[PDB]
Amino acid sequence: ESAKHMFDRIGKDVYDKVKE
User: Fold this and answer.
1) Number of C-alpha atoms within 13 angstroms, CB side, residue 4?
2) What are phi and psi of 16, to 5 degrees?
3) C-alpha span between 5 and 19 (Å, rounded)
4) CA-CA distance, 3 to 6, in Å (whole number)?
5) 1-20 burial, b if ≥16 CB within 10 A, otherwise e?
């Protein structure tokens, strides 16, 4: 759901833009 779609994105969004 929402807390496993926003947290799923956040986990590899400002983690993917962080590791770059």
Assistant:
1) 1
2) -70, -45
3) 20
4) 6
5) eeeeeeeeeeeeeeeeeeee
Residue with tokens 């590791």: 19
Approach to solving: NMR
At 2, list the tokens. Answer: 């929402």
Q: What DSSP line would sit under 1-20, residue for residue? A: -GGGTHHHHHHTTTTHHHH-
